[PDB]
Amino acid sequence: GEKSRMLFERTKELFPGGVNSPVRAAVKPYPFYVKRGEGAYLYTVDGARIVDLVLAYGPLILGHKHPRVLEAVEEALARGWLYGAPGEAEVLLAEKILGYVKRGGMIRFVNSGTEATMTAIRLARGYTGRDLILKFDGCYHGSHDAVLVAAGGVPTSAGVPEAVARLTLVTPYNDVEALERVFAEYGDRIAGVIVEPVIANAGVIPPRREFLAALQRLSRESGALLILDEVVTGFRLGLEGAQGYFNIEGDIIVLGKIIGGGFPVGAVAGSREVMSLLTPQGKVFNAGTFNAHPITMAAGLATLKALEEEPVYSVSREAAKALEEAASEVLDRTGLPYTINRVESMMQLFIGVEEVSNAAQARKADKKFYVKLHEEMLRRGVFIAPSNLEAVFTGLPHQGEALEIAVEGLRSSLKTVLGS
Amino acid sequence: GEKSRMLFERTKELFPGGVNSPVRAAVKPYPFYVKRGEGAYLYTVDGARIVDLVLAYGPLILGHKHPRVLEAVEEALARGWLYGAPGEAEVLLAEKILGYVKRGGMIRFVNSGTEATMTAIRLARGYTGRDLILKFDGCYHGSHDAVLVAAGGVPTSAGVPEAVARLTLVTPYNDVEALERVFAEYGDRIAGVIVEPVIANAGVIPPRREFLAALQRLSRESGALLILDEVVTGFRLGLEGAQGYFNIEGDIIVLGKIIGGGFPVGAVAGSREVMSLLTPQGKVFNAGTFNAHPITMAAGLATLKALEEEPVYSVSREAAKALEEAASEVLDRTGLPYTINRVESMMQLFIGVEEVSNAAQARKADKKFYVKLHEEMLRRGVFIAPSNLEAVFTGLPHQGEALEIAVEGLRSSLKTVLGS
Ligand SMILES: Cc1ncc(COP(=O)(O)O)c(CN)c1O
Ligand SMILES: Cc1ncc(COP(=O)(O)O)c(CN)c1O
Chain A closest-CA separation from residue B26 CA (Å): 9
Helix axes B209-222, B176-186, angle to 10 degrees: 10
Q: Is the distance from CB of B273 to CB of B249 less than 8 angstroms?
A: no
User: A-contacting residues of B 15-44, CB under 8 Å?
Assistant: 15-17, 19-27, 31-38, 42
The C-alpha R_g of chain B, in whole angstroms, comes to: 21
The dotted CATH code for A1-66+311-420 is: 3.90.1150.10
**CB of A196 closer than 6 angstroms to any ligand 1 atom:** yes
Chain B residues near residue A256 by CB distance under 8 angstroms: 289
Q: Which residues pair with B154 in a beta bridge?
A: B150
Q: Which of B52, B229, B251, B366 is catalytic?
A: B229
Chain A residues near residue B282 by CB distance under 8 angstroms: 16, 158
**Structure determined via:** X-ray
- Identify which of A128, A277, A161, A158 has the alpha carbon closest to the alpha carbon of residue B164: A161
CB contact under 8 A, B143 and A280: no
Q: How many CB pairs under 8 A join A and B?
A: 376
DSSP-derived 3-state class of residue A73: helix
Residue B209's alpha-carbon distances to A150, B140, B173, B174, B349, in angstroms, are 45, 20, 12, 9, 22
Q: Cα(A413)–Cα(A392) distance, rounded to whole angstroms?
A: 15
The DSSP secondary-structure symbol of B33 reads: P
As for chain A, the residues directly before each break of C–N over 2.5 Å are 152
Q: φ and ψ at A34, to 5 degrees?
A: -95, 135
Torsional class of A282: left (φ above 0), alpha (ψ -120 to 50), beta (otherwise): beta
- Residue burial A328-356, b: 16+ Cβ < 10 Å; e: rest: eebbeeeeeebbbbbbbbbbbbbbeeeeb
Q: Is the distance from CB of B64 to CB of B397 less than 8 angstroms?
A: yes
Give the closest ligand to the alpha carbon of residue B229.
2
The dotted CATH code for A67-310 is: 3.40.640.10
- H-type alpha helices, B12-109: 67-78, 89-101
CB contact under 8 A, B20 and A45: no
Tally of CA atoms within 13 A in the half-sphere of B171 that contains its CB: 19
Neighbours of A188 (CB within 10 A): 12
In terms of DSSP bridges, do strands A132-137 and B190-195 run parallel, antiparallel, or are they unpaired? unpaired
Q: Note if the bond before A280 is cis, omega within 30 degrees.
A: yes
Q: Cα(A174)–Cα(A361) distance, rounded to whole angstroms?
A: 12
Chain B closest-CA separation from residue A330 CA (Å): 29
Q: Kindly give, in sequence order, each residue whose CB lies less than 8 Å from that of residue A172, ignoring residues fewer than 6 positions away.
A: A136, A137, A138, A178, A358, A359, A360
Q: Note if the bond before A29 is cis, omega within 30 degrees.
A: yes
- Identify which of A98, A99, A100 has the alpha carbon closest to the alpha carbon of residue A108: A98
Q: Does A275 touch chain B (CB under 8 A)?
A: yes
Domain residue spans in chain B? Answer: 1-66+311-420, 67-310
Q: Does B277 touch chain A (CB under 8 A)?
A: yes
User: B-contacting residues of A 141-200, CB under 8 Å?
Assistant: 143-146, 148, 156-161, 163-164, 166-167
Q: Note if the bond before B280 is cis, omega within 30 degrees.
A: yes
CB contact under 8 A, A161 and B131: yes
As for chain B, the residues directly before each break of C–N over 2.5 Å are 152
- Identify which of A310, A265, A331, A335 has the alpha carbon closest to the alpha carbon of residue A113: A265
Q: How many residues does chain B have?
A: 420
Q: What is the DSSP string of A340-409?
A: EEEETTEEEEEET-S--SSHHHHTTS-HHHHHHHHHHHHHTTEE--SSTTS-EE--TT-SHHHHHHHHHH
How far, rounded to the nearest angstrom, does the alpha carbon of residue A417 sit from its chain's CA centroid?
A: 28
B140 included as an active-site residue: yes
Neighbours of A86 (CB within 10 A): 26
Give the closest ligand to the alpha carbon of residue A266.
1
